[PDB]
Design a protein around this ligand. Structure first.
Ligand SMILES: O=C(O)[C@H]1O[C@@H](O)[C@H](O)[C@@H](O)[C@@H]1O
Length: 302
């Protein structure tokens, strides 16, 4: 018996892929390993679940790499704004040697990465006006996930930020406690945020991988043959997740458009990116040992 964690609903692309993984694992191990996925963060918010998985209280999970940054230093590289040019670049990079360096870093903190899920690009949405240039972010209080890099990101754009659990964002928008947040289409849609924050502006400022990972303790207990089988199941599940993801993005977009959401491309994404320089400079000064990881990712997209 394995318990697994997903923050999203069962029908979200990630949810479907995880159920496929769970089935394939049970089938390939002849019932020796029987994973059960707990969706909707039933077993805790993301930071607490990461903790429970490191200690082996939870057996597997789909984590966004953003919240992984405060736990695994190398993972913070993935939260540098605009580090990836597109999700396709991110997939190519994460499926190759650079992705292995991230897996190595997570393993040191007791998480065994089996495959990488996509989460598109995250963009700003708010209740007040289209964002066309960085100066339009002035005056907006924007929710971010709990990584200091995201507060720095919003601050450099011109606004102000506040870290908050995903589950709380909807009501916080409804009550006016925050003016906006940022995410991909499927989250913006499935969470209901689009019902309150009607302006979605395509900053596409973060392209965050997500892992499908196992507690090191749970991993080590297995036979060698079952590890090989579960690794295969995870790879198949990620392939499925990425296919479901593309469809899901288009379906979510059409739904929010039909609902009257105002979507705008920004004037010039490079103007937002240029403002991020101090973030990169400070990062590589703090972490000289991670500088070559930053430059290797940048260089791999020329
Ligand atoms: O903004 C957030 O908290 C959420 O964003 C979504 O894109 C991620 O898939 C989910 O893991 C995060 O919890």
């Amino acid at each position: 018996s394995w318990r697994g964690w997903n923050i999203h609903p069962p029908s979200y692309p990630n949810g479907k892929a995880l159920e496929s993984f769970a089935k394939e694992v049970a089938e390939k191990t002849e019932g020796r390993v029987e994973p059960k996925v707990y969706h909707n963060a039933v077993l805790g918010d993301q930071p607490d679940a990461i903790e429970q998985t490191r200690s082996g209280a939870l057996d597997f999970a789909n984590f966004n790499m953003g919240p992984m940054g405060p736990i695994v230093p190398a993972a913070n590289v993935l939260s540098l704004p605009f580090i990836f040019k597109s999700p396709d670049d991110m997939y190519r990079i994460m499926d190759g040697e650079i992705g292995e360096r991230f897996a190595d870093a997570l393993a040191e903190k007791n998480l065994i990465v089996l495959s990488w899920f996509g989460s598109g690009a995250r963009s700003l949405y708010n209740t007040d006006h289209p964002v066309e240039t960085p100066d339009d972010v002035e005056g907006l209080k924007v929710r971010v996930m709990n990584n200091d890099l995201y507060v720095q990101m919003i601050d450099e754009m011109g606004g102000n930020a506040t870290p908050m659990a995903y589950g709380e964002v909807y009501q916080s928008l409804k009550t006016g406690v925050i003016d906006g947040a940022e995410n991909n289409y499927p989250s913006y849609e499935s969470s209901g945020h689009y019902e309150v924050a009607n302006y979605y502006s395509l900053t596409e400022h973060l392209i965050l991988p997500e892992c499908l990972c196992v507690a090191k303790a749970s991993w080590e207990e297995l036979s060698e043959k079952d590890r090989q089988a579960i690794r295969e199941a995870a790879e198949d599940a990620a392939k499925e997740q990425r296919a479901l993801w593309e469809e899901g993005v288009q379906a979510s977009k059409q739904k929010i458009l039909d609902a009257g959401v105002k979507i705008n491309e920004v004037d010039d994404k490079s103007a937002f990116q240029a403002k991020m320089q101090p973030i990169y400079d400070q990062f590589v000064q703090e972490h000289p040992e991670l500088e070559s990881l930053v430059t290797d990712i940048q260089d791999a997209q020329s």
